[PDB]
Amino acid sequence: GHMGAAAKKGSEQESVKEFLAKAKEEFLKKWESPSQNTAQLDHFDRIKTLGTGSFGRVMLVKHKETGNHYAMKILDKQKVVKLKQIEHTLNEKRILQAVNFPFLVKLEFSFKDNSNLYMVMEYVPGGEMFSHLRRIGRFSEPHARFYAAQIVLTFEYLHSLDLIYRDLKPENLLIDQQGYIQVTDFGFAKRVKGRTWTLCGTPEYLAPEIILSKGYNKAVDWWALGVLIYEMAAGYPPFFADQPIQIYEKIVSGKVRFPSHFSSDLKDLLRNLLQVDLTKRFGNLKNGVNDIKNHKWFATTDWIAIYQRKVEAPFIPKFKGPGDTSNFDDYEEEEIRVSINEKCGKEFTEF
C-alpha cells in the first residue's frame, strides 16, 4: 500500500481521540457555567482602532493597573438590530469563554454598559493574514500548507465540540509573534448538533448548500478551507466577481479553475474540498478529517509538531515592542459615547 508508518499513524489517531475527549470535558464545564462581567470600561485606556466590522470596531487598549495590552471588540447594541445579529453576538461570547486551543484567540474579559457590548481578548500584534497576503501577492505552497495545517487542527477541535465556525477567511486570521495563526472573529460560530439554517457568512467563502438555502452542517467549514487554501496559494479566491450574485452562480456551478503553478497534489486536495456533492466532500466522509490529514499534499506535515508549535514558521512579523500597531492598517476613529439610558437591555440579558 501507500504506507509500509501505518502503525505510527494509527496510534496517533487513538491519541487524537483521547485528546478530544478531555477537551470536550473541559469545554462543557465552561459552556454550562459562563463567565460574565469580569471588567469595566474605565479599566482600560483606548489607544487605536485595529479594524472595523459589523456593529463597531476592535481597538488596541491598555489595562491601566497592569499595563497589559488587549484587543477590545466594541459592539453598539443599537446597531445589533436583526434577530440573527443578536443571536450571533451571544454565540460569540459564549463560545469564546468556553474554548481553549493554541490557535484560537483567548477571551480575557467581557462586560456591557448602557450602549455597548465589550469583549476583551489577547492582542496579536503581527497583523491579519489578509494584509500580509495582499502585500506579497500569494504564499508558496509550503507556506500556505503551514497555515492550512493549523486551520485543519482548529476545525477538528471545534467540530468535535459540535461548533461550526462559518466565517473562515484571511481577514479573520492573525499572525502571532512566533508566526503561527490565531483565529479570531467568532461572530458566526455556533454550537450545532446536526443541521442549521441561517443564511450567513462571506460571499466568496459560502458553501453551495448555504447559497441554496439547504439545512447544512459542519462540512461548510471544510468547503471554506478549500477556498482559503486556494486564496493563500493563488492570491485570489476561486469564485471571484465584483457582485455577490455573480459569486453565488460560480459557487453552485461545480466548476473551479486553477493557476498553472498549482501542484497536482494541491489541485487534487482542492477538488475534494470544493466538492458540491456532500457525499463526496473531504472532511464529510466516513474517515472524517483524516481524509484531509492523510492527503498527499500534507504528506510533509507533522501534525503533532504543528500542534505543539515545534515547527519553524515561514514568516515572523516585525515587532517594535508591546503595543506596537505597525502591522495593522489605519481606520477612522470615533469617540465612544455611553448613553445615560440602558439600551436593548432585554435582548442582551445573557451577555
Binding site: 479594524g51 466590522g53 459589523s54 436583526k82 434577530l83 440573527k84 445579529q85 450571533h88 489578509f130 495582499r134 466565517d167 477567511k169 481577514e171 461572530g187 458566526f188 441561517t198 443564511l199 450567513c200 457568512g201 462571506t202 460571499p203 466568496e204 485570489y236 479566491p237 471571484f240 466577481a241 465584483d242 455577490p244 459569486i247
Partner: peptide, 13 residues
C-alpha cells in the same frame, strides 16, 4: 475581476 479589499460577512443574506 473581483473584490480585493476586506470583505464583510453578512448575518442574514
Amino acid at each position: 475581476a473581483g473584490r480585493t479589499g476586506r470583505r464583510q460577512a453578512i448575518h442574514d443574506i
